[PDB]
Amino acid sequence: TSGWTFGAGAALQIPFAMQMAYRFNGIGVTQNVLYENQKLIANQFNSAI
Amino acid sequence: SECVLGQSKRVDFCGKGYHLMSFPQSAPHGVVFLHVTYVPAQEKNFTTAPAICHDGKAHFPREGVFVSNGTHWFVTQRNFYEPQIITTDNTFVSGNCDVVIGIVNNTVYDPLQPELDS
Amino acid sequence: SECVLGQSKRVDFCGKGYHLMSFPQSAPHGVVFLHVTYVPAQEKNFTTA
Amino acid sequence: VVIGIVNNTVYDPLQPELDS
Ligand SMILES: *[C@@H]1O[C@H](CO)[C@@H](O)[C@H](O)[C@H]1NC(C)=O
Ligand SMILES: *[C@@H]1O[C@H](CO)[C@@H](O)[C@H](O)[C@H]1NC(C)=O
Numbered sequence: 001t002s003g004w005t006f007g008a009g010a011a012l013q014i015p016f017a018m019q020m021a022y023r024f025n026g027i028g029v030t031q032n033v034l035y036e037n038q039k040l041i042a043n044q045f046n047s048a049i
Numbered sequence: 050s051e052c053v054l055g056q057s058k059r060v061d062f063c064g065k066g067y068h069l070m071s072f073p074q075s076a077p078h079g080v081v082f083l084h085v086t087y088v089p090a091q092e093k094n095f096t097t098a099p100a101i102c103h104d105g106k107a108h109f110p111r112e113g114v115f116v117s118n119g120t121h122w123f124v125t126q127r128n129f130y131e132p133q134i135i136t137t138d139n140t141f142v143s144g145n146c147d148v149v150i151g152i153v154n155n156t157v158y159d160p161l162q163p164e165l166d167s
Numbered sequence: 168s169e170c171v172l173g174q175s176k177r178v179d180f181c182g183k184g185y186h187l188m189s190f191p192q193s194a195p196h197g198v199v200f201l202h203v204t205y206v207p208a209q210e211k212n213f214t215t216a
Numbered sequence: 217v218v219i220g221i222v223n224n225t226v227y228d229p230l231q232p233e234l235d236s
């Protein structure tokens with residue numbers, strides 16, 4: 001629900017799509033790379049789980 | 050080495066919150082670190098969208114997130130509320146609107162247009 | 168502290184590949200981490216300057 | 217609002233010559 005934030009302080013809610021988008025941005029991959037193919041990413045994560 | 054002589058991205062390695070620096074202090078048979086950290090406070094809710102649909106193109110934030118105070122949309126840095134007008138300078142474009150889930154219509158102001166008239 | 172509560176740039180610390188996020192799972196006498204990581208695939212050559 | 221400010225001009229690359 002809040003990602004990295006509750007470790008730093010009070011938990012700040014954020015949509016999970018935007019959280020994973022920044023985490024993509026954290027590894028040098030722009031946000032549009034995730035948003036343009038969010039469904040494939042979700043399917044891959046579900047299949048891996 | 051990683052906190053007195055530098056700044057650490059490792060979460061909660063040197064004090065809770067975002068690490069700014071640390072100060073060493075001698076102690077008998079040990080050492081004491083005074084981890085200075087940046088702790089956010091006084092948060093408030095906002096409505097957000099992953100991207101903004103200008104005329105047939107989807108704009109994403111270069112740095113920060115889109116938020117709205119109820120009626121007007123602003124782009125602000127992620128961990129401190131400093132709202133700003135949406136412009137082509139602080140956003141970048143990639144693809145058309147319909148591919149992104151949660152896209153929202155809003156105007157993005159080109160700073161060149163009001164500047165150039167002669 | 169580093170993989171679950173944040174995102175770590177440390178290579179191969181939170182699983183192989185570029186780290187996105189991790190999920191902890193309790194286990195008897197231990198803990199189990201599910202390291203979600205981004206690994207590139209489907210390469211192709213290019214000339215560069 | 218900021219301490220340590222120093223006056224100086226900041227050049228605009230959008231209009232040093234490019235007027236039409
Ligand atoms: C955000 O909204 C929820 C539900 O309306 C509320 O419980 C919460 O306190 C709000 N957060 C802030 C910081 O006001
Ligand atoms: C949102 O901000 C704009 C610009 O600061 C202002 O004109 C408008 O009244 C604000 N609306 C609300 C609901 O705060």
Ligand SMILES: *[C@@H]1O[C@H](CO)[C@@H](O)[C@H](O)[C@H]1NC(C)=O
Binds near residue numbers: 150151152
């Ligand atoms: C968000 O959730 C509401 C209620 O479930 C739904 O009506 C809306 O379409 C959702 N929007 C997105 C972008 O997921």
Ligand SMILES: *[C@@H]1O[C@H](CO)[C@@H](O)[C@H](O)[C@H]1NC(C)=O
Binds near residue numbers: 152
């Ligand atoms: C406004 O957004 C809706 C979907 O939310 C879209 O169908 C419509 O085309 C947008 N407006 C314009 C002028 O494109």
Ligand SMILES: *[C@@H]1O[C@H](CO)[C@@H](O)[C@H](O)[C@H]1NC(C)=O
Binds near residue numbers: 210
């Ligand atoms: C790139 O070029 C090398 C040598 O020409 C070739 O072996 C390889 O299959 C090409 N493609 C990739 C993805 O490396």
Ligand SMILES: *[C@@H]1O[C@H](CO)[C@@H](O)[C@H](O)[C@H]1NC(C)=O
Binds near residue numbers: 220
């Ligand atoms: C530095 O200190 C001097 C007084 O010693 C003061 O006049 C000056 O404004 C200070 N400058 C800054 C940037 O703090």
Ligand SMILES: *[C@@H]1O[C@H](CO)[C@@H](O)[C@H](O)[C@H]1NC(C)=O
Binds near residue numbers: 223
């Ligand atoms: C130059 O700096 C001084 C002190 O910061 C300030 O009072 C003055 O207004 C500045 N010059 C101009 C033209 O604003």
